[PDB]
Design an enzyme around this catalytic site. Structure first.
Site, mmCIF file in Angstrom:
data_model
loop_
_atom_site.group_PDB
_atom_site.id
_atom_site.type_symbol
_atom_site.label_atom_id
_atom_site.label_comp_id
_atom_site.label_asym_id
_atom_site.label_seq_id
_atom_site.Cartn_x
_atom_site.Cartn_y
_atom_site.Cartn_z
ATOM 1 N N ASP A 64 0.824 -1.201 0.000
ATOM 2 C CA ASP A 64 0.000 0.000 0.000
ATOM 3 C C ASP A 64 0.864 1.259 0.000
ATOM 4 O O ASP A 64 1.977 1.248 0.516
ATOM 5 C CB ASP A 64 -0.902 0.006 1.238
ATOM 6 C CG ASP A 64 -2.318 0.434 0.927
ATOM 7 O OD1 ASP A 64 -2.877 -0.048 -0.080
ATOM 8 O OD2 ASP A 64 -2.879 1.238 1.703
ATOM 9 N N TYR A 66 1.991 4.996 1.412
ATOM 10 C CA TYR A 66 1.818 5.731 2.658
ATOM 11 C C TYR A 66 0.516 6.516 2.589
ATOM 12 O O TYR A 66 0.169 7.071 1.544
ATOM 13 C CB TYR A 66 2.985 6.689 2.894
ATOM 14 C CG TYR A 66 4.329 6.051 3.185
ATOM 15 C CD1 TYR A 66 4.512 5.230 4.288
ATOM 16 C CD2 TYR A 66 5.425 6.310 2.373
ATOM 17 C CE1 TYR A 66 5.749 4.662 4.562
ATOM 18 C CE2 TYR A 66 6.658 5.751 2.632
ATOM 19 C CZ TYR A 66 6.820 4.934 3.730
ATOM 20 O OH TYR A 66 8.057 4.382 3.981
ATOM 21 N N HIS A 67 -0.218 6.565 3.701
ATOM 22 C CA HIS A 67 -1.525 7.214 3.697
ATOM 23 C C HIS A 67 -1.548 8.540 4.452
ATOM 24 O O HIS A 67 -2.627 9.112 4.642
ATOM 25 C CB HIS A 67 -2.597 6.265 4.245
ATOM 26 C CG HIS A 67 -2.311 5.745 5.618
ATOM 27 N ND1 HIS A 67 -2.384 6.535 6.745
ATOM 28 C CD2 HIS A 67 -1.974 4.507 6.047
ATOM 29 C CE1 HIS A 67 -2.092 5.808 7.808
ATOM 30 N NE2 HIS A 67 -1.834 4.575 7.412
ATOM 31 N N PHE A 77 8.166 2.914 -0.088
ATOM 32 C CA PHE A 77 9.030 3.240 1.047
ATOM 33 C C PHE A 77 9.549 4.675 1.026
ATOM 34 O O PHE A 77 9.992 5.179 2.061
ATOM 35 C CB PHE A 77 10.204 2.256 1.146
ATOM 36 C CG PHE A 77 9.796 0.872 1.569
ATOM 37 C CD1 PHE A 77 9.216 0.657 2.813
ATOM 38 C CD2 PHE A 77 9.979 -0.213 0.723
ATOM 39 C CE1 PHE A 77 8.827 -0.613 3.205
ATOM 40 C CE2 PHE A 77 9.595 -1.489 1.110
ATOM 41 C CZ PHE A 77 9.019 -1.688 2.354
ATOM 42 N N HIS A 187 9.563 -8.175 6.791
ATOM 43 C CA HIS A 187 9.312 -6.786 6.435
ATOM 44 C C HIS A 187 10.083 -5.851 7.372
ATOM 45 O O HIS A 187 10.173 -6.118 8.575
ATOM 46 C CB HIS A 187 7.812 -6.506 6.516
ATOM 47 C CG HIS A 187 7.394 -5.242 5.837
ATOM 48 N ND1 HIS A 187 7.494 -4.006 6.440
ATOM 49 C CD2 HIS A 187 6.864 -5.022 4.611
ATOM 50 C CE1 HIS A 187 7.046 -3.079 5.612
ATOM 51 N NE2 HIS A 187 6.659 -3.668 4.495
ATOM 52 N N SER A 192 8.058 -6.325 12.482
ATOM 53 C CA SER A 192 8.673 -7.572 12.048
ATOM 54 C C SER A 192 10.153 -7.446 11.706
ATOM 55 O O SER A 192 10.749 -8.437 11.269
ATOM 56 C CB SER A 192 7.926 -8.134 10.833
ATOM 57 O OG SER A 192 7.835 -7.167 9.801
ATOM 58 N N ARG A 195 12.556 -9.975 12.946
ATOM 59 C CA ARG A 195 12.246 -11.338 12.538
ATOM 60 C C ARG A 195 12.993 -11.750 11.273
ATOM 61 O O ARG A 195 12.568 -12.686 10.587
ATOM 62 C CB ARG A 195 10.739 -11.498 12.334
ATOM 63 C CG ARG A 195 9.909 -11.220 13.577
ATOM 64 C CD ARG A 195 8.450 -11.568 13.336
ATOM 65 N NE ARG A 195 7.700 -11.709 14.582
ATOM 66 C CZ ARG A 195 6.712 -10.903 14.959
ATOM 67 N NH1 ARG A 195 6.338 -9.897 14.180
ATOM 68 N NH2 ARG A 195 6.091 -11.108 16.113
#
Ligand SMILES: O=C(O)C1=CC(=C(c2ccc(O)c(C(=O)O)c2)c2ccc(O)c(C(=O)O)c2)C=CC1=O
Length: 223
Positions: A64, A66-67, A77, A187, A192, A195
């Site tokens: 998506d 950035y909103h 990004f 991500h 995350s 991770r």
């Protein structure tokens, strides 16, 4: 259409007349009548404006845009000056600081310097209603960006795909791994990043893969 790089238009304009894309355009146009939709129309396809489609060498798949206001500008990004890098991009910079020699955090989050070197920063969904993440999902954008990934998969050679997180790894799950390179990890979002993203060293690994195939490496410092 307007603001679509010519080499990209030459290969992808067959999508524009398909019913799914016509419906997608009508939905986005109607959404812009009543809501602020990011990015602005002239920046929805910035990822076609930075380099010729045949000069693409690295592909980073996003989800998506950035909103928030002034954030999204058509490269995943990335944020234009003087917007500070959002948390995912700060973690990307942090990984670069341990992965690439003498990497300098430039303060800004504009990744145009990468895109001009052939780093495609492609979101899967290319518009979003202001302040409402994923609001334009499942409207046609995914099929269109699927067509972009599919064209690169079939027509380019020796691309490096960087697939961060579950969504990106699914979108790139059909890439020919004998023809292209696929690196996968978590991500870079704070949710995350610990991770797998921290320590993944995808940026130095990308350049080694590029050079071994006789291509010029990315200068990740050129921002
Ligand atoms: O931080 C903000 O301000 C902000 C961050 C996001 C993303 C997001 C998603 C996909 C993208 O492509 C991009 C991009 O283009 O950078 C950003 C996000 C944040 C935290 C997450 O955990 C995850 C996740 O898990 O998928 C995603 C969206 C709107 C925002 O306003």
């Amino acid at each position: 259409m307007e603001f679509f790089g010519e080499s990209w238009k030459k290969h992808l304009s067959g999508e524009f007349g398909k019913p799914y894309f016509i419906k997608l355009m009508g939905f986005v146009a109607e959404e812009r009548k009543h809501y602020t939709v990011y990015p602005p129309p002239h920046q929805v396809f910035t990822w076609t404006q930075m380099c010729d489609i045949k000069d693409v060498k690295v592909v980073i798949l996003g989800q998506d845009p950035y909103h928030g206001p002034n954030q999204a500008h058509g490269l995943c990004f990335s944020v234009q000056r003087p917007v500070p890098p959002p948390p995912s991009l700060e973690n990307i910079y942090k990984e670069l600081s341990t992965d690439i020699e003498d990497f300098v955090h430039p303060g800004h989050g504009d990744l145009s310097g990468w895109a001009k070197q052939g780093v495609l920063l492609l979101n899967a969904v290319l518009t979003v209603r202001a302040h409402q993440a994923n609001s334009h999902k499942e409207r046609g954008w995914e099929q269109f960006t699927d067509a972009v990934v599919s064209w690169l998969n079939q027509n380019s050679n020796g691309l490096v795909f960087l697939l961060w997180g579950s969504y990106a790894q699914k979108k790139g799950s059909a890439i020919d791994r004998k023809r292209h390179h696929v690196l996968q990890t978590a991500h870079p979002s704070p949710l995350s990043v610990y991770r797998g993203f921290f320590g993944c060293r995808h940026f130095s690994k990308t350049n080694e893969l590029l050079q071994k195939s006789g291509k010029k490496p990315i200068d990740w410092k050129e921002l």
